[PDB]
Homo-oligomer: A and B are copies of this chain.
Amino acid sequence: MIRIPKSEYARRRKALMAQMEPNSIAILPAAPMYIRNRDVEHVYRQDSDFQYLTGFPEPEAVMALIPGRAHGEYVLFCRERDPERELWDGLRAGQDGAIGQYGADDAFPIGDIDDILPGLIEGRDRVYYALGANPDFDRRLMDWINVIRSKARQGAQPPNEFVALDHLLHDQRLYKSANEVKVMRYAAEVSARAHIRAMEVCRPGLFEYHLEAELEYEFRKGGAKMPAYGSIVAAGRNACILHYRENDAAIKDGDLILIDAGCEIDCYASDITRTFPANGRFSPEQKAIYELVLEANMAAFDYIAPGRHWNEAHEATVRVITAGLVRLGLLEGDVDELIAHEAYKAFYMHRAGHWLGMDVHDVGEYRVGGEWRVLEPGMAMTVEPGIYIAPDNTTVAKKWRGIGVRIEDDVVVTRNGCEVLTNGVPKTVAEIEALMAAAKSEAA
């Protein structure tokens, strides 16, 4: 269905090689497999960088890019075809599949890599790889180099330089292509439908996990292999726990529900947070806190455009929230003073957003040249201001305590401004209450 096309992976290989120095080689392993318990495996997730360059879904693989190589620049080591093992575990691409389906120029059994990779590294000046990212692989690499070190007298010369690959490759990933935006847009649409379903099913007497079930249900019907991250479904006081994950508490009349969840499609994330009343009607205190957050959400979009700096959106949300907290009497004093003294962090103690991509907290440098990154079209990020009044915050009136609200949207920088991908699930008080009322009467 919606996916990155085979040719785009080739294009990305080309773009990385075009930034490598001549006579160099880049090497990337696939992600490891993990055992969840005894012999039951965790769901497999390909490494984002390796996936970005190959689209190859299997474990036990290593790729090499060798610019200018006569027989072909892209080499893949992967599992061999094995009829007995594939009877149990599923089909393998094999070396023919790697060349044919996945576009490799040459492909070799993963079991033979020790007998082959050293020869390909021999004679190159630089090796590009993710130093420190996978220490097990880093040791494997040093062994291959030591093999070259033995023949030095045969005139085998090992490379003299190791260069950090993530610096270059993550900067590529920071600029989303049209097809990437397309996949993220689709993921966002699936996630928006999921959040709506959670709003429509919610009633007092259910548990937090009932709403998580609705989310996973819609995620998977959309084709998601897994969420972009563990879903947060936090009722009542639990909404003040930023990464609450118990998802096991009974839902009570009068609770707010905070839901931070998003699917992933073809290894591209979506990330949405909505907050809504469990009983379908915001109390006056809930409504006031919610609409303040919504004001900060809406203000942040005005500071996301080409030429704006990364932090401008966050700073806008700080201004809005601090001013609102003063208006409500939850903070006393001068807004500029309170910001300088960071008094708002009693209520809003996290950043307004992060890069979004193949990892939900995506790669890419937030600072360049001792300055905040300048935004350019194709960059994608979240906007997620929040307010959390702890249940034990004695400095505020009792009716405010235990209220947590976050409103998060996914956005892409465009030439003239930005594009919001998550408008498909509403966020005004009116639309939310309308949506929940309609579902309530349909069910009855």
Chain A residues in the interface with B (C-beta under 8 A): 1, 31, 34, 36-43, 45, 47-48, 68, 70-71, 83, 86-91, 96, 99-100, 103, 115, 182, 189, 205, 207, 209-210, 212-214, 216-217, 219-221, 223, 225, 228-230, 237, 240-246, 248, 250, 252, 331-333, 337-338, 341-343, 349, 358-363, 390-392, 394-395, 398, 401-402, 415-417, 419-421, 423-424
Roughly how many angstroms separate A242 CA and B246 CA in the complex, as a whole number?
Answer: 33
Task: Please name all residues of chain B whose beta carbon is closer than 8 Å to the beta carbon of A415 when the two chains form the complex.
Answer: 341-343
Roughly how many angstroms separate A417 CA and B246 CA in the complex, as a whole number?
Answer: 37
Q: Name the 3 nearest CB pairs between A and B, nearest first.
A: A213-B220, A38-B359, A217-B217
Task: Please name all residues of chain B whose beta carbon is closer than 8 Å to the beta carbon of A243 when the two chains form the complex.
Answer: 88-90
A37-B45, A216-B217, A241-B90 as given contacts; A209 in contact with B189, CB under 8 Å: no
Task: Please name all residues of chain B whose beta carbon is closer than 8 Å to the beta carbon of A363 when the two chains form the complex.
Answer: 38
Roughly how many angstroms separate A216 CA and B225 CA in the complex, as a whole number?
Answer: 12
Roughly how many angstroms separate A271 CA and B225 CA in the complex, as a whole number?
Answer: 21
Contact A359 B37 (CB under 8 A): yes
Chain A at the B interface: SS class: loop
> Could you list 17 A-B pairs, sorted by A, with CB under 8 Å?
A38-B361, A40-B229, A42-B43, A43-B230, A88-B241, A89-B243, A89-B245, A90-B243, A91-B246, A99-B250, A100-B250, A209-B223, A216-B217, A217-B217, A333-B416, A333-B417, A341-B415
A40-B360, A230-B43 as given contacts; A182 in contact with B48, CB under 8 Å: no
Contact A38 B42 (CB under 8 A): no
The smallest beta-carbon distance between A87 and chain B, in angstroms, is 6
The smallest beta-carbon distance between A362 and chain B, in angstroms, is 8
A40-B229, A45-B36 as given contacts; A343 in contact with B416, CB under 8 Å: yes
The smallest beta-carbon distance between A434 and chain B, in angstroms, is 13
Task: Please name all residues of chain B whose beta carbon is closer than 8 Å to the beta carbon of A333 when the two chains form the complex.
Answer: 416-417
The smallest beta-carbon distance between A295 and chain B, in angstroms, is 17
Most B Cβ at <10 Å: residue of A223, A228, A363: A223
Task: Please name all residues of chain B whose beta carbon is closer than 8 Å to the beta carbon of A342 when the two chains form the complex.
Answer: 415
A342-B415, A394-B424 as given contacts; A242 in contact with B100, CB under 8 Å: no
Task: Please name all residues of chain B whose beta carbon is closer than 8 Å to the beta carbon of A41 when the two chains form the complex.
Answer: 230
Task: Please name all residues of chain B whose beta carbon is closer than 8 Å to the beta carbon of A39 when the two chains form the complex.
Answer: 359, 361
Task: Please name all residues of chain B whose beta carbon is closer than 8 Å to the beta carbon of A331 when the two chains form the complex.
Answer: 416
Identical subunits present: 4
The smallest beta-carbon distance between A43 and chain B, in angstroms, is 6
Task: Please name all residues of chain B whose beta carbon is closer than 8 Å to the beta carbon of A96 when the two chains form the complex.
Answer: 1, 250
Find A392's partner among B189, B205, B398 (CB 8 Å cutoff).
B189
Most B Cβ at <10 Å: residue of A38, A70, A248, A415: A38
Roughly how many angstroms separate A225 CA and B207 CA in the complex, as a whole number?
Answer: 13
* Residue of chain B at shortest CB distance from A119: B100
Contact B216 A71 (CB under 8 A): no
Roughly how many angstroms separate A39 CA and B250 CA in the complex, as a whole number?
Answer: 29
Contact A416 B338 (CB under 8 A): yes
A37-B47, A87-B349, A213-B219 given. 18 additional CB < 8 A pairs? A42-B43, A71-B237, A71-B391, A89-B245, A90-B243, A90-B244, A91-B241, A96-B250, A99-B250, A100-B205, A212-B220, A213-B217, A216-B216, A217-B217, A333-B416, A341-B415, A395-B419, A395-B420
Contact A213 B221 (CB under 8 A): yes
A213-B221, A221-B213, A242-B88 as given contacts; A70 in contact with B40, CB under 8 Å: no
* Residue of chain B at shortest CB distance from A426: B398
Find A86's partner among B103, B241, B362 (CB 8 Å cutoff).
B241
Contact B416 A394 (CB under 8 A): no
Roughly how many angstroms separate A17 CA and B362 CA in the complex, as a whole number?
Answer: 45
Roughly how many angstroms separate A216 CA and B227 CA in the complex, as a whole number?
Answer: 13
The smallest beta-carbon distance between A335 and chain B, in angstroms, is 11
* Residue of chain B at shortest CB distance from A105: B252
* Residue of chain B at shortest CB distance from A224: B209
* Residue of chain B at shortest CB distance from A338: B416
